[PDB]
């Protein structure tokens, strides 16, 4: 419904999902703060964003050491507070994820008889020279899984 992609043959696409024992309004309140991704993203060390959070907003992220890259420039491409959809594209940085675009949706659910959230995040990206589609999807998936794990932990710590 929301995470369809048509990657070409120079691109790859995949998705990850995570169940969170927290209500949708809380998880969305975390992920909607485009100016502060470090609230749940465990690799972000600094983020700078000027102005109001709207389509076209741009944030400058520095990531922590040990990673294949150090910085990323990211543009907000979609923000839907009714259907809870967020879409971001990587427009700059010193990394190898060219024309990366991601879509994240949050959905209500019941988990252990309590209000819960299903988060899905999909992406499309160019496969960088010297790598395969499989490797690129594997790498992005590992990172996105860390991000969604931390988002689950932060949300569930807030509800407790």
């Amino acid at each position: 419904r929301f995470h369809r992609h048509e990657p070409r043959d120079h691109q790859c696409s995949s998705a990850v999902a995570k169940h969170i024992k927290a209500p949708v309004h809380l998880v969305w309140s975390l992920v909607r703060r485009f100016d502060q991704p470090q609230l749940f993203k465990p690799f972000v060390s600094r983020c700078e964003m000027k102005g109001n959070i709207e389509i076209g907003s741009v944030r400058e992220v520095n990531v922590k050491s040990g990673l294949p890259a150090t910085r990323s420039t990211e543009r907000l491409e979609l923000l839907d507070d009714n259907e809870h959809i967020l879409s971001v594209r990587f427009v700059g940085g010193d990394h190898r994820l060219k024309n990366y675009s991601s879509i994240l949706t949050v959905h209500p659910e019941v988990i252990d008889g309590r209000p819960g959230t299903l988060v899905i995040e999909s992406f499309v990206v160019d496969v960088p020279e010297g790598n395969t589609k499989d490797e690129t999807c594997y790498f992005v998936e590992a990172l996105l899984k860390c991000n969604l794990k931390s988002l689950a932990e932060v949300s569930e710590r807030l509800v407790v």
């Binding site: 922590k64 050491s65 960088p128 490797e135 790498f139």
Partner: protein
Amino acid sequence: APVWGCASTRGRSAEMEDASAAVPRFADVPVRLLASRRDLDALGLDADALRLPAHLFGVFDGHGGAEVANYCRERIHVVLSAALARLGKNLGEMGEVDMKEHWDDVFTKCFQRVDDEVSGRVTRVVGEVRSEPVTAENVGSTAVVALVCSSHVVVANCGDSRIVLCRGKEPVALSIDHKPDRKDERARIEAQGGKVIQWNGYRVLGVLAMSRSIGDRYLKPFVIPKPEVMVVPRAKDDDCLILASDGLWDVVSNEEACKVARRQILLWHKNNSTDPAAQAAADYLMRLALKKGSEDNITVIVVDLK
């Protein structure tokens, strides 16, 4: 007693995440790890009772933050000293022993215990008990340590920091970098179902450019805290030991580091806490790495072995 110098800088990096340790007389080495009980008893000496002082030097290259490198700086020598004392007491209960296996085991258990303390798997003591993880799951550190005594150097390495010995003014590698594309390391990772991906260097899952570290619990079981251990008896032609993070070794070879360190020590003595000659050698290696374009934190310990 130990003659050493230590130079460290964040360099052109924003924050400093290298840490280092230099602890004289940190422990007594059980002599039963160096010679058999039978041979010493032939001389009337009790191998379980003999005391040999040892000093510990260590370089800990942190990533994701400085907290695990600093924890290693504060804890590895304490855990190792306690483990060595316990091992001496338990060797008093045993016959002949394979010595290299016990060096491997004591260092493996020490590194694993520090890792478990970092990840909150075991409780730690500071007059107070600590239990939750020291920091986040994507924070880690290398650990290259050298136990130095009068007769032997024992090296335990976990990660891509490196220690080199200058012997006969020639380099001898006392540690092999744990790089993910190393054939045995790739085989181990791939046997566990993991991937080694060339993504700005060969990396575990494409993320981390080392196959072993302390911390990094989000990359287990692919990144392990298991050290590789080398026991090297000291020799006539020993000049010095060089421990350093990859901030040095990325831009300086083993050969150049050994030559520079040894000649700096000799030049200081000709021309003229830490030792000034070894400190000048470490400062020169640091500044050299900076001059040759190193981007990273740089930490260098030089131990004069003469």
